[PDB]
Amino acid sequence: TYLSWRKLQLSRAKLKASSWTSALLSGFAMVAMVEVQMLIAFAICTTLLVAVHMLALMISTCILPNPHERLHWYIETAWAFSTLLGLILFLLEIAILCWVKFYDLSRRAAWSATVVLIPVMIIFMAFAIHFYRSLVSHKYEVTVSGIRELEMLKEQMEQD
Amino acid sequence: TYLSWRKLQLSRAKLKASSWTSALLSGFAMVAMVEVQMLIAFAICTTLLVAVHMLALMISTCILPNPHERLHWYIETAWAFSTLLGLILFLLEIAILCWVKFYDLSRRAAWSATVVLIPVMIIFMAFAIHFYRSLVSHKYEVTVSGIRELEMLKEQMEQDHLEHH
Amino acid sequence: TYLSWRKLQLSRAKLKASSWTSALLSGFAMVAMVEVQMLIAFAICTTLLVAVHMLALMISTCILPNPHERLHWYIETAWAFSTLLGLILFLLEIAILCWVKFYDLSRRAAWSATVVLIPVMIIFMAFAIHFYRSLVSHKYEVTVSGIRELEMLKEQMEQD
Amino acid sequence: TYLSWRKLQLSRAKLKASSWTSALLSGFAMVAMVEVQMLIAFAICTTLLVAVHMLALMISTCILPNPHERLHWYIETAWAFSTLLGLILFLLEIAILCWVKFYDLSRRAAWSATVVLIPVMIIFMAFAIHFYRSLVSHKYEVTVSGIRELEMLKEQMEQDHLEHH
Amino acid sequence: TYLSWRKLQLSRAKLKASSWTSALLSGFAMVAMVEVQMLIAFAICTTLLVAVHMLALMISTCILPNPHERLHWYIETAWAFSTLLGLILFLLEIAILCWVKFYDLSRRAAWSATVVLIPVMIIFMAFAIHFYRSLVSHKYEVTVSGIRELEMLKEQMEQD
Amino acid sequence: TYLSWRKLQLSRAKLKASSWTSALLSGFAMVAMVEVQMLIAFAICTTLLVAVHMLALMISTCILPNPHERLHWYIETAWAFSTLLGLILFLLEIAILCWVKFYDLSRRAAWSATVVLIPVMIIFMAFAIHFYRSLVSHKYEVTVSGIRELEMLKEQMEQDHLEHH
Ligand SMILES: [Ca+2]
Ligand SMILES: [Zn+2]
Ligand SMILES: [Zn+2]
Ligand SMILES: [Zn+2]
Known part of the structure; x- marks a missing residue:
């Protein structure tokens, strides 16, 4: 009872957020x-960012009406993936905006900003990969896939 | 009990969202x-986007007071359809904006953007179609459904009034 | 108990929204x-839109402290009516803004936009009428009024 | 139990809203x-609107920690009054703005707008008056009411301290 | 049970708000x-307003993980004090903005606005003082301090 | 029961906020x-501020699905640290903005502002340090912790599968 209640309240706080x-x-x-009005980048980026987010939102229009378990995890992951694509795209967007504001003014600053983004983009890219890999395939393989990827890490921290 | 509670909390999180x-x-x-101030498109889109969304909002003004099941599903669907059209229109809106910001500067970017949208627009359009199809069909079923509920309400006042003496 | 609880939670989600x-x-x-700074229209519209909404809001300042049933339905309808006037006015406002942005630039587009609004304005006008008719009069007459208006529709769909 | 629960959930939805x-x-x-950057009006209005609203917000900083009944009704009313003044000031603010945007361009529109407001302003002013009248009256009752509660709190620590030995 | 539940729901509505x-x-x-871009005032004010608020927010990052009673009242008051400093600073900020918009245009209006602020600033200043006095010292002294300040008022209303 | 309920409602108010x-x-x-459109600072700050905050948001995408205790505390801390860096970066951001708005007009004001920040920045930096220190340490403990939970999940499917025959 507490488990089904917690799961439902999690889908409800996830919906609202x-x-x-x-x-x-x-x-x-x-x-x-x-407000301001490589540029192909700025356009495809803004446009993709808004489309991906609208997708997530609609996934919030349709999770409300709806064995059941496999379907709800596929939808959940589609929502989480669209949302993550949205955060990455929002970041890429701020990169491209520093770019656009600084292009004719200071190249050093713009390049510096788009660069400091890479390690975080790595973590982001990483998670986008887990959700995509989770979308096409079934829970098991990805669960083991995950144990492998984590265990190979357990060997690194010890050596140091 | 848990089912009726979950259904009600879903209409409540759906209302707030x-x-x-x-x-x-x-x-x-x-x-x-x-803020900026092919163009017929931009105007009809902004205006349609705002009208469709206000429609959704009003459907949140009226679900609150509300056999009942068929009428509540029709209204819920009118809401989901107004909402989805709003999402489509917002996407269309950002396309026309890349278009308008970039028109005299770079045609390549605007067209590239307006193009990459097509797969997403496909999924959105698809659902807009299913919801539209649910509405047109029950135009019959629901109107009646609503009559039956309003009548029962007219009848519940008549009984409630017969006891006042 | 479930009924009084649902009614109260509905007044609470209605308040917050x-x-x-x-x-x-x-x-x-x-x-x-x-941001931009028939014009009498733009002014009366903006001004009316903000006033009507402030009215609704105050109806949310006063429903909180407060047989009881008849008074709560009159207040509820006053809130719903002020709110609906607000949505319509927000729409009229976007019409007048396409108008104001496009006046000296493209008349065709502006007129097209204010026009596509009419069927939706019809549905909106319709509901504004039900709430107003509900405000002056008592539940019964409007309940029957509603059955009449719906039944006369039942005859149309069948013929086709 | 249902009454105390409803009252508390009403102070909680009132806080959040x-x-x-x-x-x-x-x-x-x-x-x-x-964004734009008779004028004495515009400044006093913006500034009053923001000060009155910050007053409301702070009344949400202090209701959270809190006989008790009289003090809680006074504070609730100070909140409702600050809130209502804020709504009035916001309306006044949009009037002065039609005024300021339209001044050198079209006098007719601005005056028309500033005029149609009068019935709504009447209702708002009316309530502002009732709330003001509730405050001025109990300036006496409440101050005392607050003393009695703070004393009881001073006394509850004294008893709670008498048992420590 | 109802008391601990109410206290927890108050910390939860306080967090969200x-x-x-x-x-x-x-x-x-x-x-x-x-958007616009005594001036030392405008800068120290904007900057202080954002810093004080970020402080409050972090106090919402840290109240979540956390005898206990004395520590929770010190944190609570630190949050309430940072928040109040934020409201005052937001007000001072709007004063300084009327100032900055009106300086070269109409001195009369600007001075009038910054002036109408004083009585409210008094109430604000008053409360900022109660929370600061509550932060350094313990509940008792401030509780009695409060009874004294209120009782000396009880004598004034009667005379009139 | 009250403890597990309070903990869950705290992760839920923390998620929403x-x-x-x-x-x-x-x-x-x-x-x-x-809107405005030493400068290397402004760009790295805006970009870092937005990246760190998106990190926090994603940590709200992933806490929802989720021995467990150690892994949930690490993730919670990654969230609190991303969040705090975001607050620091936002403060840094308003400083660089006073800087940029005031640069050619009044140097005194900008420097005064950028200076008064220092005590607050001290407290913020302090906590950023404690959270960072909690992360680096358990890089070991948690990875393992996560393995144990994922394994148990691999095992719970194996048992759940052994019964299907
Ligand atoms: Ca601008
Ligand atoms: Zn009779
Ligand atoms: Zn003693
Ligand atoms: Zn097998």
Whole structure:
């Protein structure tokens, strides 16, 4: 009873927070584009960021009406993946904006900013990979896949 | 009990999230329009986006007071459809904006962006179609359904009144 | 018990969502006016939109402290009516803004936009009428009024 | 039990909605002022609107920790009054803005707008009056009420301390 | 049980509302500064306002993990004090902004606005004093301090 | 029961407030950057502020699905640290902005502002240090902790599968 209650309250706080950030990010970004008015990058990025988020939101329109377990994990992962694509894209977007503001003014600063992004982009890229790998395949293989990837790490910290 | 409780908490998280995003998207889009100040597209899109979203919001003004099951599913669906059209229109809106910001500067970028949207637009359009199809069909079933509930309400006042003497 | 609990939680989600959208719409609209700076229309519209919403909000200041049934339905309908007037006015406002942005630039587009609004404005106008008719009169007459309006529709779908 | 529970959930939805709108209106109005950049009016209004709303917010900082009944009703009323003044000031603020945007361009529109407001302003002013009247009256009752509660708190520590030995 | 439940739900509505307003005020103010671009005042004010609020927010990062009673009242008061400093600073900020907008245009209006602020600033200053006095010292002294300050008032209303 | 309930409601209010402020700060800062349009500082700050906050948000995407205790504390801490860095970066961001708005106009004000920040920055930095120190240490403990939980999950499917015949 406590488990089913906790699971349902988690889907409910996830719903409220998903719609929340998806809409606020999407909006703040659209406004960021009209306020300033590699450029193919800026356009595909803004546009992709808003589309990916609208996807997540719709996944919040449809999880509400809806064995059941396998379908709910596929939808859940599709939501989490669309959302993560949204955070990455929002980051890429701020990179491209430092770029666009600084292009004709200071190249050093712009390049510095887009660069400091790489390690975080790595962590982000990493997780996007786990959710994608989780989407096509079934829980087991990815569960073991995960144990392998973690165990190979257990060997590194000890050596040091 | 757990089922009726979960259903009610789902209409309640759906209410709070619906009003939320409808107002934030609508407001943000209107502001996006005034800030820049093929064009017939931009106007019809902004205006349609805001009208469709206000429709969703009102569906949150009226689900609150509310056999009942068929009528509540129709209304819920009118909400999901208004909401989804709003998402589509918002996406369309950001496309036309890349278009408008980039028109005289770089045609390549705008067209590239407007193109990469197509797979997502496909999924969105698909669902818009299913929801539309659910509405047109029960236009019959529901109207009646609503009559039966309103009648029962007219009858519940008649009984409640017969006891006052 | 479940009924009184559901009614109270509905007044509580309605409170939180009312204040939410009333304030966000009002604000977004005020900002839309200062950012651009038939015109009598634009002014009466912005001004009416913010006033109607502030009304709704105050109805959320006063439902909190408060047979009881008849008074709570009159207040509820006053809130719902002020709120609906707010959504319509927000729509009229975006019409007038396409108008104001496009006036000297492209008349075709502006007129097209204010026009596509009419069927939705019909549905909106319709509901504004039900709430107003509910405000002056008592539940019964409007309940029957509603059955009549719906039954006369039942005859149309069959013929086709 | 249901009554005390409902009362507490009402102070809790009132808290969350108060802070909500106070911050959004205040912020949005400040931004409305800097974006345009009879005038004495515009300044006193923006500044009063933001001060009155910050008052409401603080009343949400202090209701959280809190015979008790009289003091809690006074504070609740100080909140409702600060809140209502904020709504009035926001309305006044949008009027002065139609005024300021339209001044040199079209006098007719601004005056028309500032006029249609009058019935709504009447209702708002009315309530502002009732709440003000509730405050001035119990300035006496409550101060004492607060003393009695603070004393009882001083006494509850004295008893709680008498047992430590 | 009802008491511990109410206390916990109060810390929970305080958390959600604190983060809410702290972030919205901070943001609206930063944006107010870049949109316009005694001045030492404007800078120290904007900067202080955002710092004080970020403090409150972090106090919402740390109250979540955490006799216990004395520590929770010191943290609670630190949060309430940072928050109050934030509201005052937001007000001072709007004063300084009327100032900055009106300086070269109408001195009368600017001075009028910063002036109408004083009585409210008094109430604000008053409360900031109670929370500061509560931070350094223990509950008792401040509790009695409070009874004294209130009782000396009881004598004034009667005379009139 | 009350303890597990309180812990779960704390992760739930922390989730809702985390996503809340992360998105509002990030969006507001990006907009602050485009509106003005030593400089290497401004860019790295805006970009770092938005990246760190998106990190926090994602930590709200992943706490939802989730011995367990050690792994949940590590993740919670990664969240608190990403969140705190975000607050620091936002403060740094408003400093560099006073700097940038005031550079050619009044040097005195900008420097005064950037200076008064130092005590607050001290407290923030301090906590950033404690959280960082909690992370680096358990890099060992947790990875293993996670393995043990994932294994147990691999084992729970194996048992659940052994019964299907
Ligand atoms: Ca601008
Ligand atoms: Zn009779
Ligand atoms: Zn003793
Ligand atoms: Zn087998």
